[PDB]
């Protein structure tokens, strides 16, 4: 009916409060902070063996294993130290857009255009990987999956919704429906009580896995959002968009802090991850290479150019001793 | 050197061998999209096969294995997942010749998006004009000017069909590295698979020549 009137009124007073909170700027504060200096990484191992484009990775908690999803229908679990493979899971649907690694190491998630989140069980009496549950009820295509523990998972589909599942009973237990475009990224907070989701509506939302309803939204981009990641402490999150720009917010202040841009890049961002200390902000562009940003000085720091196609995914180990980037060149490079 | 890491690398080599022997077997099949605008008979084209989400259909004709990926239940923004089908051999398109009730331009608009897309610069587009019987039964007591007022031609099945085929064909903006095969099927025709087979083998010859460098 007329509900749009009070909707926009609440939006406007929200903006007013946001203006009331901006009493300082990161640019003003970082006046005298030493630049991080030019870092120079290099390929250490090359994890070849895929036969098509790679769409996602995720590091284990031990910082030695990693799982990569491709369109060849395979879900390889590598061993980053010695490059020899461990498992090769053949999927029932070759179209995969995401993968995940449970913190305990027992389970691996994988979903795609089939919009069924299949949880794969690794450690069993018999020695082959089996699929445990097939989570369904989504009406779109899965974009990202993350494990809270061995019993709970959260998905994000193109049906403009994100949902918290329950692996045991296989029933949706809380649906987050306040968004308005195709969701394409998730990032659980380290304390595992609240997560964000950046989507095609040029807006990022942070939820509350208990109340099951968004607590604050962010609107600062000119186009769709492709990757999110929580800042390690748990009070910030970086974003990537198609408009060659990454942005870093903070939650307790509900504002923006810095914007990373350069006139020499007109490509899009595909994945964003932080370092252990938060001083470095990795971001995998689709102009055939990754970039390294100083999350405070806003200037470019390093370049990771070793691929022959779009960089489609990257991640940083828990111990902070490595970074891994995947690309549509069917390869998977690990840096140090 | 190793204690049983030798056994570990042996397992790695074995599953690498399995990955090749599976990739070489999944690379023999030829892949096809199956798009469509609305109620166009993509269901009927599927029903001419021999033997939620994305539904697949596998069938073999004359010792050639096919795969037809059907989307359309995936009601979402195309630009996010259309880049997954980059290496498909062809895109079997389907429109409805009896589309004057639509409240056809939507199909005509859609064809422009997928034929001139940035990921399909070198992918042939088989085009299936459907419901020719309905066209014949309908144009006898109606103008074609409803879809195109500026059209200046007779009101007869052959002329109308030729004009509409040309009208879809000229939307192609990259006339050099593509090809738009066209066919006028009906709900009773039984050579649609044969036409698809001919188109796919022609595209295979094209790709082999362009790889060998002659083309």
């Amino acid at each position, epitope marked *: 009916d007329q509900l749009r009137q009070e909707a926009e009124q609440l939006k406007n007073q929200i903006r007013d409060a946001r203006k009331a909170c901006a009493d300082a700027t990161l640019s003003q504060i970082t006046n005298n902070i030493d630049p991080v200096g030019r870092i120079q990484m290099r390929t250490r191992r090359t994890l070849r063996g895929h036969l098509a484009k790679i769409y996602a990775m995720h590091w284990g908690t031990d910082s030695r294993l990693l799982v990569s999803a491709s369109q060849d229908g395979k879900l390889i679990i590598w061993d980053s130290y010695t490059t020899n493979k461990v498992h090769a899971i053949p999927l029932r649907s070759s179209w995969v857009m995401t993968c995940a690694y449970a913190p305990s190491g027992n389970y691996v998630a994988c979903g795609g255009l089939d919009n069924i989140c299949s949880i794969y069980n690794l450690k069993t*009496r*018999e020695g082959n990987v089996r699929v445990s549950r097939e989570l369904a009820g989504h009406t779109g295509y899965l974009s990202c999956c993350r494990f809270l523990d061995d019993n709970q998972i959260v998905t994000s589909s193109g049906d403009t919704t994100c949902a918290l599942w329950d692996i045991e009973t296989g029933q949706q237990t809380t649906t987050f429906t306040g968004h308005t475009g195709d969701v394409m990224s998730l990032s659980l907070a380290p304390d595992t009580r609240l997560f964000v989701s950046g989507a095609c509506d040029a807006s990022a939302k942070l939820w509350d896995v208990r109340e099951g309803m968004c607590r604050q939204t962010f609107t600062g981009h000119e186009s769709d959002i492709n990757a999110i990641c929580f800042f390690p402490n748990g009070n910030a999150f970086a974003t990537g968009s198609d408009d060659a720009t990454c942005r870093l917010f903070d939650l307790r202040a509900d504002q923006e802090l810095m914007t990373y841009s350069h006139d020499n890049i007109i490509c899009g961002i595909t994945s964003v991850s932080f370092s252990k200390s938060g001083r470095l902000l990795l971001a995998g562009y689709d102009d055939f290479n990754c970039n390294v940003w100083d999350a405070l000085k806003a200037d470019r720091a390093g370049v990771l150019a070793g691929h022959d196609n779009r960089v489609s995914c990257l991640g940083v180990t828990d111990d902070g001793m490595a970074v891994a980037t995947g690309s549509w060149d069917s390869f998977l490079k690990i840096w140090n | 050197l190793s204690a*049983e890491d030798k*056994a570990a690398v042996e*397992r790695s080599k*074995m599953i690498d061998r399995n990955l090749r022997e599976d990739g070489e077997k999944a690379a023999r099949e030829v892949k096809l999209l199956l798009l469509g605008a609305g109620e166009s008979g993509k269901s009927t084209i599927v029903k001419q096969m021999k033997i939620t989400g994305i539904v697949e259909t596998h069938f073999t004709f004359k010792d050639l294995h096919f795969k037809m990926f059907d989307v359309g239940g995936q009601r979402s923004e195309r630009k996010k997942w259309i880049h997954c089908f980059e290496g498909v051999t062809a895109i079997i398109f389907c429109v409805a010749l009896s589309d004057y009730d639509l409240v056809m331009h939507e199909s005509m608009k859609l064809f422009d998006s997928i034929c001139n897309n940035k990921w399909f610069t070198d992918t042939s587009i088989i085009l299936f004009l459907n419901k020719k019987d309905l066209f014949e039964e309908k144009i006898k007591k109606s103008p074609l000017t409803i879809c195109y007022p500026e059209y200046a031609g007779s009101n007869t099945y052959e002329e109308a069909a030729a004009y509409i085929q040309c009208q879809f064909e000229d939307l192609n903006k990259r006339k050099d590295t593509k090809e738009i095969y066209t066919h006028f099927t009906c709900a009773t025709d039984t050579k649609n698979v044969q036409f698809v087979f001919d188109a796919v083998t022609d595209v295979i010859i094209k790709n082999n020549l362009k790889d060998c460098g002659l083309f």
Partner: single-chain antibody, 231 residues
Framework: VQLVESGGGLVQPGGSRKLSCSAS????????MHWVRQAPEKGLEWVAY????????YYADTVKGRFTISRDDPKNTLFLQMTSLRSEDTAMYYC??????????????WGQGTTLTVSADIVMTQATSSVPVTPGESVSISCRSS???????????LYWFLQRPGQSPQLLIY???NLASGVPDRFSGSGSGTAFTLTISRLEAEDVGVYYC?????????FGAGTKLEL
């Protein structure tokens, strides 16, 4: 999860026999399998081995040449061939599986066993025969190797085994530290380089038996003499 073997009986010296192990209940093709023996009132001694896919095969020096071993994946069966049976071979033969990848648990499962009656390397010495105990208090068992088992890669290759009276042995801990599945979280293991210790926290009635030490670094797999926790 279910291995049963057959082929035993009585043989004449210098003769021949075939041994078969029927695998039913797991992915046989991706598991390597071994063969270990037990002379009466004696310990364990490694015999043979096949890697997954029959890629690599090793043997034991005392049975080299006159034993040949092979497997048939589609039928899920393990074959061991007896030729020229000597006299120091009367033993009850076991059928043990093992898979090798990062974080795996080799020697997970052990078959029942069959009796075959015929009428320079690593050395492990547990140096103890029997320790008397009562239910309730802790107890420790020691093991000693010839050379340091700590491979430079980072992990130490020492296994521990348990054998209830009249039963097939099972695995307690692997890599000196990690517990095995289905084992109560009251065992433990420790040590460094050459000295090794196993510590039961609070004994129970179902723990009396003989415990065996075993290395895996050099490939000839020598076992221990045998330690009995006869209550």
């Amino acid at each position: 999860v279910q291995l049963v073997e057959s082929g035993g009986g009585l043989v004449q010296p210098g003769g021949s026999r075939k041994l078969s192990c029927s695998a039913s209940g797991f992915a046989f093709s991706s598991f390597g399998m071994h063969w270990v023996r037990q002379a009466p009132e004696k310990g364990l001694e490694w015999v043979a081995y096949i890697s997954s896919g029959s890629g690599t095969i090793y043997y034991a020096d005392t049975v080299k040449g006159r034993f040949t071993i092979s497997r048939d994946d589609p039928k899920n069966t393990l074959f061991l061939q007896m030729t020229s049976l000597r006299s120091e071979d009367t033993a009850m033969y076991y059928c043990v599986r093992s898979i090798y990848y990062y974080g795996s648990s080799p020697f997970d499962f052990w078959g029942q066993g069959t009796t075959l009656t015929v009428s320079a390397d690593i050395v492990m010495t547990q140096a103890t025969s029997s320790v008397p105990v009562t239910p309730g208090e802790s107890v420790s068992i020691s093991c000693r190797s010839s050379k340091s088992l700590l491979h430079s890669n980072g992990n130490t290759y020492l296994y521990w085994f348990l054998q209830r009276p009249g039963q097939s042995p099972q695995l307690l801990i692997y890599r000196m530290s990690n517990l095995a599945s289905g084992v109560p979280d009251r065992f433990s293991g420790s040590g460094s380089g050459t000295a090794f210790t196993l510590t039961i926290s609070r004994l129970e009635a179902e723990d009396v038996g003989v415990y065996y030490c075993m290395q895996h670094l050099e490939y000839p797999l020598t076992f221990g003499a045998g330690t009995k926790l006869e209550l």
